[PDB]
Write a sequence for this structure.
C-alpha cells in the first residue's frame, strides 16, 4: 500500500579541474532528472556544501538531510538524502562515522584512506502512516577491512533504529558484486536483498561508472547499489545510460520502484 521511487546517485564533487564536466555545467541537468523521473527519495554521494545548497535551490519540493564528513558540519563531502517534503515526514535522522567509534566526528576507520560516513533517517509516509528507514552511505575504495566493518555497522544501526521494519540502504560502495563487502551485507543473518538482482523488471545499462563516458561500456563496472530488507517488493530497476553530450555525472544513477509491506 506504500509506493516509493528510490534512487542512489553519486554526483561527482565540484572540481574546477573537470572543466566542461564541472558541477556548474551539470547542476540543472541533475535537478531536472530528479524532478522528471519524480524521485521520492534520493541518497546521493560526493556532495560538497555548495552543491548541497544548489540541490536545495533546484529541488524546492524536496529537502536534504546530512552534514559534512570532516567536521560534522559543512566541511567535506556529504552523503545526503533528499525527499518529497509533502510526501514524507522525518521522525528522526542523523549521521555516524564508518569507524571503530561511529560517534567520533571526522574519525577514520581501519584500512580506510578517507573519512567515510552514513546518513540515515526514519521516515513516515504522511498518507499511509507507514514507517521505514533510509540509509545512504559512501564506502572506502582502498580499505578492505573498513568496508567489511562499515557493512556490519550499518546492519547494527538498522536493527537499532527501526528493528525489523522496512529499510533501504543506498550508496557508492566502490566495489562490484564480486567483492567481499558485497557478500557481507548479502549473506548476513540480517537479510539484505540486492534490489538490482531481485527486481521483477530491469531496464537501462548494467554499469554505474563510466568516468564521464571515457571508459568503454564493456569495461564498465557496477559499484553503486540499492539494498532492501526482505519485506520490500522491488517492482523494477533502471540505470539510464549516460549521454556524452548532456552528461549528468561520471556515475549513472540507479532507480528502483519499491513497495513497502
Amino acid at each position: 500500500k506504500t509506493d516509493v521511487r528510490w534512487a542512489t546517485f553519486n554526483i561527482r564533487y565540484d572540481n574546477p579541474q573537470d572543466s566542461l564536466n564541472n558541477w556548474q555545467y551539470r547542476k540543472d541537468r541533475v535537478c531536472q532528472f530528479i524532478k522528471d523521473h519524480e524521485l521520492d527519495i534520493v541518497g546521493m554521494q560526493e556532495v560538497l556544501h555548495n552543491q548541497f545548497q544548489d540541490l536545495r535551490a533546484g529541488l524546492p519540493e524536496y529537502d536534504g538531510i546530512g552534514v559534512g564528513r570532516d567536521d560534522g558540519k559543512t566541511a567535506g563531502e556529504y552523503a545526503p538524502l533528499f525527499y518529497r517534503k509533502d510526501k514524507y515526514e522525518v521522525l528522526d535522522s542523523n549521521t555516524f562515522w564508518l569507524a571503530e567509534n561511529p560517534d567520533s566526528v571526522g574519525m577514520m576507520g581501519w584500512d580506510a584512506v578517507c573519512v567515510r560516513i552514513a546518513t540515515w533517517a526514519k521516515f513516515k509516509d504522511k498518507a499511509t502512516g507507514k514507517i521505514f528507514m533510509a540509509v545512504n552511505t559512501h564506502f572506502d575504495h582502498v580499505g578492505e577491512e573498513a568496508r567489511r566493518q562499515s557493512a556490519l555497522l550499518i546492519i547494527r544501526k538498522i536493527k537499532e533504529i527501526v528493528g525489523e521494519r522496512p529499510a533501504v540502504v543506498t550508496g557508492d560502495f566502490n566495489v562490484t558484486d564480486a567483492s567481499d563487502a558485497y557478500e557481507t551485507i548479502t549473506t548476513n543473518e540480517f537479510v539484505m536483498k540486492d534490489a538490482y538482482k531481485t527486481a521483477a523488471r530491469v531496464t537501462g545499462v548494467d554499469y554505474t561508472f563510466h568516468d564521464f563516458a571515457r571508459i568503454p561500456a564493456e569495461d564498465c563496472e557496477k559499484i553503486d547499489f540499492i539494498f532492501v530488507t526482505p519485506q520490500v517488493l522491488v517492482k523494477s530497476c533502471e540505470i539510464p545510460a549516460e549521454v556524452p553530450e548532456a552528461l549528468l555525472s561520471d556515475h549513472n544513477p540507479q532507480l528502483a520502484d519499491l513497495e513497502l509491506e
Q: What stands out?
A: Residues 96 and 120 are 9 Å apart (CA to CA). The chain has five helices and 13 strands. The first strand starts at residue 2 and ends at 10.
